[PDB]
Amino acid sequence: KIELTFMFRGQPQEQTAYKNVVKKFEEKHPNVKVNIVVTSPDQYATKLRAAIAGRKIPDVFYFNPGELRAYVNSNVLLDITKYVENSKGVNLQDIWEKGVNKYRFDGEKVGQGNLYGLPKDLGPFALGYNKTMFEKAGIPLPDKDKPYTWQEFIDVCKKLTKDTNGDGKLDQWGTGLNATWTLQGFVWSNGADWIDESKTKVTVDDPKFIEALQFFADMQNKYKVTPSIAEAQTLDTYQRWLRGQLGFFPVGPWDLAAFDQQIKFEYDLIPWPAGSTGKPATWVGSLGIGVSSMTKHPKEAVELALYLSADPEGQKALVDQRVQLPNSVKVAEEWAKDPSIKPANKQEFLDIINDYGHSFPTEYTYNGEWYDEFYRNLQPVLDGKMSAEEYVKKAKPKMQKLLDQAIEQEKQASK
Ligand SMILES: OC[C@@H]1O[C@@H](OC[C@@H]2O[C@@H](O)[C@H](O)[C@H]2O)[C@H](O)[C@H]1O
Ligand SMILES: [Ca+2]
């Protein structure tokens, strides 16, 4: 007799996994029916923004931690603190503190106070390598703890780049990294960032940032350890990694089901190569599961969010279906130590969460438009048509104006 709308995003395997777990929820709560609105990851932001613009908000939905403050100011998210406190034996204290705290807001700052969402997951973005490829080539395996230097990384990528079937054409490459998701680690491990410590000034014109961005573009254009521009257009590097054509490619826990189904070679996880700091860097993603401020059924809505985030049965089903690592810290630690579950070094995921992972810069700002503008016009750098130095000088004032507006608009919306 109760109906909830649950809006979310995922790759195909994730959609299937969450749809299955929602059916489990419906079995446990036969009086609640959940109507699903699901999109691809790239389509999600536009569809959720449209729902919010029309004040027709789904009862339960994924959202970006960087939107928390804005969503609170516009009364989008219900304060679910009391519903969670009164809930049957769930203890958020077993859940990653870093995850829980992204969705707390005390009226002034994120990280403390009332709960406005529950963590879907934490998403450490690790580096994978193709072990089959290394062993066929006779190249010593990467170390599981000590990062390659950038020069060492290029050296091995060059050794992996070859014509394996002897037809005269390269058909295997060291890597093929997507700047949207992998530039951050090179920037951060080189002691740079998109914005300063105060999170109010754009710093992409830092020589350290420029060096990292130029090195990144140089993998394709100068060192030539990737498929060509045309080859990547023909078949993107994610697909080429699945087919066993690339030595290195990132791995997130959300990839594991897809990789189980499609990857036939052996692969394992390693630290990212490190720049001038000598310390590896990468990001830890997260999404929140929120409840509409306007929902007619707040108890049931929070029960669904809890079932996906913290309930041992709901969580076990998600982890079993290989679309995330456990939200419970103790369960995650035991998971990582189980050698029957691959990759062998899935401990690297926890090392990222605990030690060397960072947040996206937009998690700190009121909106992310300033950062989207950096990426919007980045491709000529990546394809060698414009230098990193020339681009960041051009982009910086456009980014700064947008960041300044985010800062101001925060002041005006929180009155
Ligand atoms: O394109 C391959 C895909 O991109 C990387 O993941 C980035 C991002 O994170 C998830 O939340 C979204 O599904 C995805 O677009 C990974 O390399 C791979 O999943
Ligand atoms: Ca060939």
Q: Are 323 and 253 in contact (CB under 8 A)?
A: yes
Q: Which residues contact 123 (CB under 8 A, 6 or more apart)?
A: 252, 253, 254, 284, 285, 286, 287, 324
Amino acid at residue number 140: P
41 alpha carbon – ligand 1 mean position (Å): 8
Q: Which domain holds residue 81?
A: 1-415
Pairing of strands 118-124, 2-9: unpaired
The answer to whether the CB of 181 is under 6 A from ligand 1 is yes
Task: Indicate the DSSP class of residue 87.
Answer: S
Closest CA to ligand 1's atom 7: 181
Q: Kindly give the distance from the C-alpha atom of residue 51 to the centroid of ligand 1, in angstroms, as a whole number.
A: 24
The rounded distance, in Å, linking the Cα atoms of 23 and 348 is 32
> Strand, helix or coil at 1?
coil
DSSP assignment letter at 65 = G
Between CA 15 and CA 32 the distance in angstroms is 20
Task: Name the residue among 74, 67, 40, 87 with its Cα closest to residue 309.
Answer: 87
Domain total in the chain: 1
CA distances from 379 to 217, 309, 312 (A): 9, 37, 44
Exposed/middle/buried for residue 22 (C-beta within 10 Å: 0-12, 13-18, 19+):
buried
Three-state SS at 313: helix
- Torsion, Cα 67 68 74 79, to 10 degrees, reads 150
Q: Is 265 in the pocket of ligand 1 (CB under 6 A)?
A: no
- With beta carbons less than 8 A apart as the criterion, state whether 313 and 24 touch: yes
Q: Which residue has the tokens 């490829």?
A: 133
For residue 182, what are its two tokens? Answer: 């992998």
| Distance from C-alpha of 267 to C-alpha of 134, rounded to nearest angstrom | 10
Q: What separation in Å is there between the alpha carbon of 233 and the centre of ligand 2?
A: 18
Q: How far is the CA of 175 from the centre of ligand 1 (A)?
A: 16
- Binding positions for Ca(2+): 163, 165, 167, 169, 171
- CA 241, 244, 250: angle at the middle one, nearest 5? 30
Whether residue 397 has its Cβ less than 6 Å from ligand 1: no
Say how many CA atoms lie within 13 Å of 247 toward its Cβ.
26
CB–CB of 113/106 below 8 Å?
Answer: yes
259 lines ligand 1 (CB under 6 A): no
Token readout for 215 is 């090195």
DSSP labels, 154-188? HHHHHHH-B-SSSSSS--BBS----HHHHHHHHHH
CB environment 39-66: b (16+ within 10 A), e (fewer): beeeebbebbeebbeeeebbbbbbbbbb
Known binding-site residues equal 163, 165, 167, 169, 171
Rounded distance from Cα 171 to ligand 2 centre (Å): 5
Q: Is the CB of 273 under 6 A from ligand 1?
A: no
Q: What are phi and psi of 127, to 5 degrees?
A: -105, 125
Rounded to whole angstroms, how far apart are CA atoms 334 and 339?
10
Contact 282, 360 (CB under 8 A): no
Give the separation between CA 93 and CA 114, rounded to whole angstroms. Answer: 15
- Residues near ion ligand 2 (Cβ under 5 Å): 163, 165, 167, 169, 171
DSSP assignment string, 111-156: TSSEE--EEEEEEE-EEEEEHHHHHHHTPPPPPSSSPPBHHHHHHH
- Which experiment gave this structure? X-ray
Binding site membership of 373 for ligand 1 (Cβ less than 6 Å): no
Q: Are 239 and 176 in contact (CB under 8 A)?
A: no
> Nearest bound ligand to CA 9?
1
